[PDB]
Design a binder for this molecule. Structure first.
Ligand SMILES: CCCCCCCC/C=C\CCCCCCCC(=O)OC[C@H](O)CO
Ligand SMILES: CCCCCCCC/C=C\CCCCCCCC(=O)OC[C@H](O)CO
Ligand SMILES: CCC(CC)Nc1cc(C)nc(Oc2c(C)cc(C)cc2C)c1C
Ligand SMILES: CCCCCCCC/C=C\CCCCCCCC(=O)O
Length: 407
């Protein structure tokens, strides 16, 4: 049977590798590779591709004579293969951070957290008025004691000076409504705002926060063009204003949002933070593991299982912890979907459901294999053959899954 299990493993690994590669090319071709969803999926696929390819290399290490010798390149392959193992876990954790944040925090919140900055503690602004969050003014009393109270009425609860991230969102949402009220009352801004789609409306609100209604109104020809959906020409005119000269970066992002329609400008910035979770963090982990092996376990290409001293827990450790956290995220996401978002049916909530549905489908497929790992008749043959199939086709499931989310 052992030969059968080996044949299935090579067959599966081939299939999953091809599947992953096809999915990756798909995501690269897409114009949506700009979206944050697709950046994570593509990186997730890459992380998976690398592991499958390394598997075939690892197969060469296996032959006894190389296994025994513990050659230098042998050790590199084992470490590399393990690195990609952690990469897989952390990228999956990547998707889970995104999904969780996707429901709890709106796009417009994220845009103006990059552009004006988020401060969770009470601070005094430039002219000395107490301000918290994304540019929210509490009151103009000189006594911070009074300010703590003013925040409490706003939030509903006693604050002691420091508000939760979810609370800042409520403050921010309030400000956005105020901005819209102002926009609708403005004779110049109103026709333009009403014609714009949701993403561009956000970009208009961005300028309102920085310049004011009166300031944004001053852009007569840019807004005319905006209204006539002449986005390329509208962008040209927006630069010429000195707003651009004084704050190029924020202006470029806001202007670019007018052109495209998308969040691409802000999404790139967000993506670097995911990148660290997926490739950045597992690298110190694997380095620490490799030192451990050099110190007490220099045998057998680093793949020897010795009972022994636990060195594999240096990388296995974080893999386990990352998983638990994802469960906590999932637990919170599912509850939110029942709790507030039953009746919502927005563009975001539909996708989040579709994702959660797919996660639930994905999670037993990958999970059973670990369950079978802890616990060890014709039915014994069925255990091994099942194992051989699940591990080998692990990659294929990921390819299908990523594609399903993208759709
Ligand atoms: C010796 C090696 C140590 C090196 C340490 C590496 C970590 C530092 C990395 C980034 C710093 C620069 C980040 C600048 C990018 C910020 C972009 C942005 O958000 O800001 C736009 C601007 O605020 C609106 O005008
Ligand atoms: C046939 C024998 C040789 C073995 C070869 C293995 C066969 C499965 C491999 C590829 C399927 C990948 C799944 C693709 C799912 C298509 C649905 C999809 O969403 O496509 C659009 C894409 O997401 C836009 O970004
Ligand atoms: C378990 C072994 C591992 C091997 C790759 N698979 C993983 C790893 C991780 C971290 N999360 C997974 O799923 C989730 C969970 C649990 C929560 C959320 C919010 C999102 C996703 C995609 C799977 C299927
Ligand atoms: C939000 C992610 C938190 C990241 C903290 C860890 C910083 C990245 C660690 C190592 C990257 C170096 C390559």
């Amino acid at each position: 049977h052992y030969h059968v299990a080996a044949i299935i493993n090579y067959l599966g690994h081939c299939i999953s590798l091809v599947a992953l590669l096809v999915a990756f090319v798909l995501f690269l071709r897409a114009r949506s590779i700009r979206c944050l969803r697709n950046i994570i999926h593509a990186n997730l696929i890459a992380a998976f591709i690398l592991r499958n390819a390394t598997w075939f290399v690892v197969q060469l290490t296996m032959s006894p004579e190389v296994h025994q010798s513990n050659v230098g390149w042998c050790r590199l392959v084992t470490a590399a293969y393990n690195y990609f193992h952690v990469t897989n876990f952390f990228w999956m954790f990547g998707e889970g951070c995104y999904l969780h944040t996707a429901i709890v925090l709106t796009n417009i919140f994220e845009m103006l957290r990059i552009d004006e900055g988020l401060r969770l503690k009470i601070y005094k602004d430039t002219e000395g008025y107490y301000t918290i969050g994304i540019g929210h003014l509490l009151t103009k009393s000189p006594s911070l004691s009074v300010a703590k109270s003013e925040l409490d009425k706003a939030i509903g609860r006693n604050s002691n000076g420091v508000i939760t991230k979810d609370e800042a969102e409520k403050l921010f949402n309030q400000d956005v409504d105020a901005a819209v009220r102002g926009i609708l009352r403005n004779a110049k801004l109103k026709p333009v705002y009403d014609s714009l789609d949701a993403v561009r409306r956000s970009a208009l609100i961005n300028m309102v926060f920085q310049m004011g209604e009166t300031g944004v109104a001053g852009f007569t020809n840019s807004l005319r063009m905006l209204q006539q959906k002449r986005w390329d020409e509208a962008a040209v005119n927006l630069a010429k204003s000195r707003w651009y000269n004084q704050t190029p970066n924020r202006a470029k992002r806001v202007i670019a949002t007018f052109r495209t329609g998308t969040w691409d400008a802000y999404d790139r910035l967000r993506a670097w933070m995911f990148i660290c979770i997926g490739w950045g963090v597992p690298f110190p982990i694997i380095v620490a593991w490799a030192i451990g092996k050099l110190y007490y376990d220099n045998e057998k290409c680093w793949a020897g299982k010795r009972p022994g001293v636990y060195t594999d827990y240096i990388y296995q450790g974080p893999m386990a912890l990352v998983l638990l956290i994802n469960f906590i995220f999932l637990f919170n996401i599912v509850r939110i979907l029942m709790t507030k978002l039953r009746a919502s049916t927005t563009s975001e909530t539909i996708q989040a459901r579709k994702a959660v549905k797919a996660t639930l489908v994905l999670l037993p497929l990958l999970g059973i294999t670990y369950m079978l790992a802890f616990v060890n008749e014709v039915s014994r043959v069925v255990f091994i053959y099942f194992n051989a199939f699940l591990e080998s086709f692990q990659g294929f499931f990921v390819s299908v899954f990523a594609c399903f989310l993208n759709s």
